[PDB]
Structures are given as structure tokens and as C-alpha cells.
Amino acid sequence: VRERMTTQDVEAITPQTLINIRPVVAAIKEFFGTSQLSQFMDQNNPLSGL
DNA sequence: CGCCCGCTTCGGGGCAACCCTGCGTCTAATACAAATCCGGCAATGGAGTCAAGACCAGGTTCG
Numbered sequence: 600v601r602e603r604m605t606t607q608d609v610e611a612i613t614p615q616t617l618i619n620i621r622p623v624v625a626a627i628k629e630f631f632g633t634s635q636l637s638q639f640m641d642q643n644n645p646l647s648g649l
Numbered sequence: 650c651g652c653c654c655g656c657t658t659c660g661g662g663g664c665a666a667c668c669c670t671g672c673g674t675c676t677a678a679t680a681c682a683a684a685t686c687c688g689g690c691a692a693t694g695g696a697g698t699c700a701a702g703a704c705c706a707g708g709t710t711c712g
């Protein structure tokens with residue numbers, strides 16, 4: 600946003616144009632898969648999930 | 650008696666070898682020439698195929 604605040608022209612831009620959500624959604628998808636703390640639920644008896 | 654000056658001794662620095670406190674989207678085409686694929690006839694010419702048809706030789710039948 601701070602980059603394209605300057606390169607864009609004024610009196611034409613909007614928050615729909617300024618905002619790129621793809622690094623945020625890539626950070627979420629890169630956390631939930633392929634991290635240490637996000638593991639498969641160990642279920643072979645209900646004590647193990649707990 | 651004091652004094653220089655390199656010899657040894659330790660310090661500090663410097664450096665070489667391993668992990669994560671690591672791990673962004675970008676003008677946009679035109680113009681043209683050469684090379685290459687490929688699609689479709691257009692000569693085949695050699696290689697396979699059918700069929701007749703002849704070739705006797707020795708069992709096989711008949712005299």
C-alpha cells in the first residue's frame with residue numbers, strides 16, 4: 600500500500616484499488632499447512648485427542 | 650648502581666566453520682524475416698501375394 604500510494608494518481612484511487620489481500624491469505628494458508636505448530640489430530644482413542 | 654632490548658607469556662582480536670531470532674506483480678507491443686512443421690497429392694519401385702502350373706519319386710492300387 601505504501602508503495603502504490605505514490606505511483607498511483609490521486610483523484611482516481613480507492614481502497615478497492617489500494618488493497619492486495621493475497622499476501623495475507625498466503626500467510627494464513629502458509630501457517631495452517633506446513634508449520635511446526637499445525638499438526639494432524641492424533642486420534643486413535645478419545646484420550647489421545649484430548 | 651641504572652638502563653635497553655629482544656624473548657617469552659598471556660590477551661585480545663580476528664577469523665574460519667555451522668544454524669533461523671531466516672524464509673513480492675510490475676509498460677506493451679508492432680514489424681518482419683527466417684526456419685520449420687505439416688498436409689496433401691505425385692512420381693514411383695521393390696517387396697509381398699495369388700494362382701496356375703509344371704517338376705518327377707516313391708508309396709499305392711490295379712493288370
Ligand SMILES: C/C(=C\[C@H](C)CCCCC(=O)O)[C@@H]1O[C@@H]2C=C[C@@H]1OC(=O)\C=C/C=C\C=C\[C@H]1O[C@@H]3C[C@H]1O[C@@H](/C=C/C[C@H]1O[C@H](C[C@H](O)[C@H]1C)[C@@H](O)[C@@H](O)/C=C/CC/C=C/C2)[C@@H]3C
Nearest residue numbers: 632633634635636637638639640641642643646647648649
Ligand atoms: C518433534 C516434534 C513433533 C513430532 C513429529 C511428534 C512428537 C515427538 C515426541 C514423541 O516422540 O512423542 C515437535 O513438535 C512441535 C514442533 C517441533 C517438533 O516438530 C518437528 O520438527 C517434526 C514435525 C512437525 C509437523 C508435521 C506435520 C505433519 O507430518 C504428518 C502430518 C502432520 O503431523 C505429523 C503428525 C503429528 C502428531 C504426532 O503426535 C504424537 C504421536 C505421533 O508421533 C504423531 C501422530 C503424540 O505424541 C502427540 O500427542 C504429541 C505431539 C507433540 C506436540 C507438538 C510439539 C512441538 C505427521 C507425521
